Amino acid sequence: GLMQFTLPVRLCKEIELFHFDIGPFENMWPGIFVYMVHRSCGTSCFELEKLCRFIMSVKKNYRRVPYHNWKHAVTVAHCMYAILQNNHTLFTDLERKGLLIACLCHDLDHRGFSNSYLQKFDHPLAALYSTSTMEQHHFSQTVSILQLEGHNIFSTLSSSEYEQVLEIIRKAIIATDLALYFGNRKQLEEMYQTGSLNLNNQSHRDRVIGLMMTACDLCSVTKLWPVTKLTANDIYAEFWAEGDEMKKLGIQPIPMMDRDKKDEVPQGQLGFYNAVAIPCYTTLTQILPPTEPLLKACRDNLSQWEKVIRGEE
Numbered sequence: 001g002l003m004q005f006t007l008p009v010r011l012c013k014e015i016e017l018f019h020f021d022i023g024p025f026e027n028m029w030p031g032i033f034v035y036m037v038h039r040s041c042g043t044s045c046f047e048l049e050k051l052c053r054f055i056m057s058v059k060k061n062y063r064r065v066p067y068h069n070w071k072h073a074v075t076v077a078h079c080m081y082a083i084l085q086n087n088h089t090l091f092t093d094l095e096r097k098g099l100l101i102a103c104l105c106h107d108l109d110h111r112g113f114s115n116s117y118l119q120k121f122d123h124p125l126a127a128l129y130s131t132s133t134m135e136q137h138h139f140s141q142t143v144s145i146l147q148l149e150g151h152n153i154f155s156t157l158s159s160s161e162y163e164q165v166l167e168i169i170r171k172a173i174i175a176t177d178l179a180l181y182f183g184n185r186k187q188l189e190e191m192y193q194t195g196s197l198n199l200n201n202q203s204h205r206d207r208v209i210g211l212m213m214t215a216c217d218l219c220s221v222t223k224l225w226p227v228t229k230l231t232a233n234d235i236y237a238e239f240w241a242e243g244d245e246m247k248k249l250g251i252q253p254i255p256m257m258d259r260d261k262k263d264e265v266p267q268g269q270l271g272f273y274n275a276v277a278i279p280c281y282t283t284l285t286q287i288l289p290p291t292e293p294l295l296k297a298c299r300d301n302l303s304q305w306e307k308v309i310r311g312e313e
């Protein structure tokens with residue numbers, strides 16, 4: 001039990017900060033995640049043998065796509081770690097366990113295509129799961145991996161603790177469907193502003209955990225500008241591949257996905273910051289004040305894109 005994961009000094013210090021980038025060394029990402037579980041949760045909350053085997057099976061079931069890959073999973077898990085560590089006392093033992101795993105597993109077996117493309121292609125997954133298509137698949141994949149021999153990291157939880165954590169993970173992964181984000185945030189905005197928000201109301205927690213998941217998922221817009229700008233290439237590589245596939249189905253894609261309209265990206269980023277990312281981190285900061293650094297970094301990156309449009313870069 002007395003085996004700690006230890007990171008070089010720079011990573012040890014910077015991993016605590018919201019804007020940490022996990023770096024280009026793939027083989028350090030597992031250690032970085034176990035490190036975050038040990039500090040967030042405890043060295044006893046998982047059997048290392050089972051955790052390690054769970055992490056490497058999850059890694060294996062992420063695909064070699066430009067953005068929705070293993071690096072994305074660990075990046076989203078790290079943002080969640082930063083939130084839990086800046087909000088120590090507000091979350092239960094089970095919520096800390098469930099949510100880091102939820103974040104690691106939230107895009108399992110992503111193919112690089114939106115729910116929309118699956119529906120218009122008429123993919124079997126779109127028949128199995130009529131809404132939040134990929135997110136139901138992601139949870140399904142999470143459950144399948146937990147059930148491989150020697151992979152059940154929740155074994156030593158009671159039957160009711162176990163049912164609770166799988167329920168936390170299911171809602172967390174479903175909430176990463178950005179189509180559900182708009183309504184979730186509207187409701188949390190209303191409840192905060194009437195003083196009706198109660199963290200003892202489970203269905204209020206559910207919504208707050210929902211908004212944290214959107215925050216962690218979108219967290220590439222909260223990094224130092226050079227990280228944010230370079231992730232955007234990966235994001236748009238997937239978008240333009242989906243646009244190509246739309247044109248193959250005979251559908252003109254939205255401009256976001258059309259690689260012909262590559263000139264419109266800077267304005268498209270402003271819309272996304274203004275319509276999605278700024279509202280998301282604003283409402284998160286209202287509910288969880290210590291997550292303000294995510295709103296601040298997001299605002300800095302909005303300004304960086306405004307400079308791109310104004311020809312200053």
Ligand SMILES: CS(=O)(=O)c1cccc(-n2ccc(=O)c(-c3ccnn3-c3cc(F)ccc3F)n2)c1
Nearest residue numbers: 067178217218219220221235256268269272275276
């Ligand atoms: C038209 S809309 O409903 O506003 C809508 C639907 C889907 C994607 C975007 N969108 C546009 C521009 C971006 O930069 C991102 C972005 C930034 C960080 N993560 N993501 C992201 C988020 C996802 F959910 C999926 C894939 C992603 F790259 N997302 C907008």
Ligand SMILES: [Cl-]
Nearest residue numbers: 039040085088
């Ligand atoms: Cl601590």
Ligand SMILES: [Mg+2]
Nearest residue numbers: 106107134176
């Ligand atoms: Mg997803």
Ligand SMILES: [Zn+2]
Nearest residue numbers: 106107176217
């Ligand atoms: Zn994601």
